[PDB]
Structure formats: structure tokens, C-alpha cells
Design a protein around this ligand. Sequence first.
Ligand SMILES: CCOP(=O)(O)OC[C@H](O)CO
Lengths: 65, 49
Amino acid sequence: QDLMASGNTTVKATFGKDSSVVKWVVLAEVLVGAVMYMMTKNVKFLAGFAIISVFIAVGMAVVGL
Amino acid sequence: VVDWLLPVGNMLEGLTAPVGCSYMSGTVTDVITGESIISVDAPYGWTVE
Ligand SMILES: CCOP(=O)(O)OC[C@H](O)CO
């Protein structure tokens, strides 16, 4: 038989690549990384401009329904 | 001979009339036979079936 835990495709369309999660995680870096030049003012927080698309691909393509 | 057949003639007419009966304890059998194909448911996706 089937299962009762899924069968609605609700969490897949909400927490996925083609949803709204990828938009709320791309603006959080510029909200704090682009304003920390007051006290620090050093080239340090620049290694996060490429790991955003990588972390979302190594976690969503694990199962894939 | 005709006057002698008074008790004998009455028995031949009594064995033809319907006589009531009294029950005791009857049996009602319940036997079921069949199959069931199933357608189981489915689942888813796947495819194949
Ligand atoms: C050089 C790129 O930045 P980081 O690797 O964060 O530098 C480590 C030290 O804080 C240098 O001051």
C-alpha cells in the first residue's frame, strides 16, 4: 500500500529550490556582511558569495521524491 | 346387519375428518454454502498487470 505521511506535495513546493526559501537566504548575508565595515573594516566575509547555490544543491537533490 | 354397523360405521367416518395436532419441538437447520473471490489496491507509478 501507500503511506499517509505524504501524498500532497506540500512541503516540496514550500521548502525547495523553486520556492521562497532561496530568496530569504540570499538577503541575510548582505544585511549583516555589508554593514560590518564599521568596527572591523577588513576583507574577511567574502567567502559566502558562492556557497549559497552549492549548499542548496547538495541537500535538495539527495532524495528527490 | 344394518343396525349392527352403528359403532363400525362411525369409525369409518371419523378417520376421514381432519384431526388437529399438537407440536413438540421442531428443528430449523441453517446451512450456508458459498465462496468469496477478492482487486488488492494498485500502489503508485509501476507498470505491467
Ligand atoms: C584573508 C581573507 O579573510 P580571512 O580568511 O577571514 O582572514 C583571516 C584573518 O582574520 C586575516 O586578518
